[PDB]
Amino acid sequence: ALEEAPWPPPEGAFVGFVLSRKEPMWADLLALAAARGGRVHRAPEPYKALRDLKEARGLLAKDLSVLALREGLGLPPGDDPMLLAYLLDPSNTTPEGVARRYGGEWTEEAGERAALSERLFANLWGRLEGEERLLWLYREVERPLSAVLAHMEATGVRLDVAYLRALSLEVAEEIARLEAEVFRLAGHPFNLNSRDQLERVLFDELGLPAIGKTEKTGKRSTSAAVLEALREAHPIVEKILQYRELTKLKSTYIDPLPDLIHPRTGRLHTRFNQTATATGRLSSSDPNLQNIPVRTPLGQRIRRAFIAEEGWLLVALDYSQIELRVLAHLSGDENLIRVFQEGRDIHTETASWMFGVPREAVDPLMRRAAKTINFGVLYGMSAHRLSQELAIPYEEAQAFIERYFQSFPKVRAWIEKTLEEGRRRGYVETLFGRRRYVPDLEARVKSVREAAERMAFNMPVQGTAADLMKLAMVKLFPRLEEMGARMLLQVHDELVLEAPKERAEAVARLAKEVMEGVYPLAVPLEVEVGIGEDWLSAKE
DNA sequence: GACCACGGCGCC
DNA sequence: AGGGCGCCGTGGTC
Ligand SMILES: Nc1ccn([C@H]2CC[C@@H](COP(=O)(O)OP(=O)(O)OP(=O)(O)O)O2)c(=O)n1
Ligand SMILES: [Mg+2]
Ligand SMILES: [Mg+2]
């Protein structure tokens, strides 16, 4: 019922747009529109009309901003109803769901999307009236962050395409040797990529013991954890596990990545989704650059393909024991706090016990393997699983889960306190007040209930760490532009920067200080920083 | 060509 | 039976 008015609209209008595809760096701006003051303005030519806007206000404001930056236009994203709804409830991840829940319908017409954005913002803003903690997260964190993420996506990252092309040819030959040996041992060829066909060969034909079942379908599992106990006694299992590793890296990273280079920027562009997680974390998609291999030596080779522009250097900064430090602040445990005040390393100490090796002989590989243990046990890891991963008896596993807790009596108390709030209020909170609704805390089925519990007390820890990182990105970004530096990637507790070689050292120091003193806790926040030509070298 | 579910697995 | 994600190939389908 809005009054149709000719383009352009006045400043402050809510924008509506339609893309040919979800990726703003690859999308064709099909239509553009705006709504304000009971009026709607439809653009005759979307691309030309994009120059008329001063800022992007409305649903998916960041995506339009990325496309604008792609066209060399300085169009910063502003108010976004998606961010408002996401703070009220992280379950609000899609424009279709948000519009349905908060008044309206997500259609495929720009004018209607513009009117929807204006209408959704008014209602959602009313929902936040009174929520001062959520409003603070919106004004001081989420909204300015959308501008930062827009620049990150539009900038992209340089990739050594020729290196990955040559690597693909080499790996393919290595894969052929493994699959050929598997088929020989099986006595017949089959689809090794098919876990169903593999299940028959291993358990029915070869008569191997089945120790685990799948979650949904309840089939005999062929996962790495299951095959691990079988790998040393049987050669074929060893071959499969090696086959799994090669094909995983080749089909997910080595092959698709080089084909995603933008023809105009010459770099690889990912998407940093701001409303996709239930804890407040960001996510990376199309392609996912938050899961680039780093553990295995072969996986490290892939990470070397991520390089800096000529004359530039990569700067990688990582928070040290971030969730363990957050836990000390939230729980207020005197003992755990003093641990960080003395400058101890839990990850190193745990690895010392796992491998029976002095603290001065613990390599990075050993230390990273202890992360799964420390974080695992912390968030309710069964004593059975730990004994299976460490190749140690179940009795030694029980003692470790135990010994992990008595040192800090407050941690147990914080968990139980957190769970009660979730059962009563219906949600749990981070340090800054970010919520997550966990209804299954009172489920009558124990497996479902206990699973919901583990989701419940993990959120304040993972979420707070996410809030700290987001706030750090907001403060650091303008400091990089003034130095001619770039913010490329975010990996939960890691920031990948690109700086000129004559300013790389200065950027590294500044970014480190910003991240460490973004929001002081009861324990000091430490950050490890490295500089290199590639991502792997940038992290020592 | 593409949706949906699943197992599986990469990272944090 | 640690938590949080996204993408792979397969299977079944449309
Ligand atoms: N297996 C893992 C690994 C990590 N995390 C969470 C905890 C911290 C956050 C970042 O991960 P890391 O940086 O790898 O762990 P860290 O404690 O920060 O160790 P480091 O000192 O090496 O950074 O992700 C987790 O839940 N489970
Ligand atoms: Mg870290
Ligand atoms: Mg990290």
Q: Which residues surround ligand 2, an ion (CB under 5 A)?
A: A 318-319, 493
> A481 φ, ψ to 5°?
-65, -35
Alpha helical stretches, state H, A405-445: 409-425
Question: Tell me, what amino acid is at A341?
Answer: Q
A168 Cα: distance to centroid of ligand 1 (angstroms): 30
Q: What gap in Å lies between CA A367 and CA A362, rounded to an integer?
A: 7
* Through-space distance between the first and last CA atoms of chain A, rounded to whole angstroms: 61
Q: What is the total residue count of chain A?
A: 540
Ligand 1 in contact with A136 (CB < 6 A)?
no
For ligand 1, atom 5, which residue shows the shortest CA distance? A375
Q: What gap in Å lies between CA A222 and CA A229, rounded to an integer?
A: 11
Locate A457 and state its tokens.
Answer: 């007390």
Residues of A (163-202) placing their beta carbon closer than 7 angstroms to any atom of strand C are: 191, 193-194, 196-197
A213, closest nucleotide (Cα–C1'): B7
Q: What gap in Å lies between CA A31 and CA A20, rounded to an integer?
A: 9
Q: Are A486 and A480 in contact (CB under 8 A)?
A: yes
CB atoms within 10 A of CB A229: 14
Q: What gap in Å lies between CA A243 and CA A198, rounded to an integer?
A: 13
User: Which residue has its C-alpha nearest to nucleotide C10's C1'?
Assistant: A194
Ligand 1 in contact with A346 (CB < 6 A)?
no
Q: Which of A281, A317, A320, A322 maximizes ligand 1 atoms within 8 Å of its Cβ, making it the mutation to test the pocket?
A: A322
Secondary structure (DSSP) of A121-154: HHHHHHHTTT-HHHHHHIIIIIHHHHHHHHHHHH
Q: Measuring CA to CA, how many Å separate A326 from each of A29, A329, A427? A: 43, 5, 19
Asked whether strand B has any atom less than 7 Å from the CB of A491, the reply is yes
User: Which residue shows structure tokens 């990739």?
Assistant: A159
Domains of chain A: 1-154 (3.30.420.10), 155-271 (1.20.1060.10), 272-321+466-540 (3.30.70.370), 322-465 (1.10.150.20)
For ligand 1, atom 26, which residue shows the shortest CA distance? A375
Residues of A (256-295) placing their beta carbon closer than 7 angstroms to any atom of strand B are: 288, 290-295
Locate A176 and state its tokens.
Answer: 């052929």
Q: How far, in Å, is the CA of A244 from the C1' of nucleotide C10?
A: 15
Ligand 1 in contact with A318 (CB < 6 A)?
yes
What is the stated resolution of the deposited model, in angstroms?
A: 1.9
Strands of A199-305 (E only): list them.
Answer: 271-273, 283-285
Element holding A488 (H helix, E strand): strand A486-490
CB atoms within 10 A of CB A349: 16
User: Which residue shows structure tokens 């950050």?
Assistant: A527
Residues of A (158-197) placing their beta carbon closer than 7 angstroms to any atom of strand B are: 195
For ligand 1, atom 25, which residue shows the shortest CA distance? A375
- The residues pairing with A29 across neighbouring beta strands, listed in sequence order, are A19
Query: Which residue, A225, A463, A531, is CA-closest to A326?
Result: A463
Asked whether strand C has any atom less than 7 Å from the CB of A288, the reply is yes
Q: Are A479 and A518 in contact (CB under 8 A)?
A: no
Alpha helical stretches, state H, A187-304: 195-199, 224-228, 235-249, 297-303
Q: Are A84 and A128 in contact (CB under 8 A)?
A: yes
Ligand 1 in contact with A492 (CB < 6 A)?
yes
A214, closest nucleotide (Cα–C1'): B7
Ligand 1 in contact with A242 (CB < 6 A)?
no
Burial (CB count <10 Å: 0-12, 13-18, 19+), residue A253: buried
Ligand 1 in contact with A379 (CB < 6 A)?
no
CA A296 to chain centre: 20
Q: What gap in Å lies between CA A273 and CA A152, rounded to an integer?
A: 12
Locate A346 and state its tokens.
Answer: 């839990």
Q: What gap in Å lies between CA A418 and CA A421, rounded to an integer?
A: 5
- The residues pairing with A317 across neighbouring beta strands, listed in sequence order, are A495, A529
- The residues pairing with A42 across neighbouring beta strands, listed in sequence order, are A33
Exposure on the CB side of residue A378, measured as CA atoms within 13 A: 25
Q: What gap in Å lies between CA A238 and CA A178, rounded to an integer?
A: 10
What are the b/e assignments for A511-536, b being 16+ CB within 10 Å?
Answer: bbebbbebeebbbebbbebbbbebbb
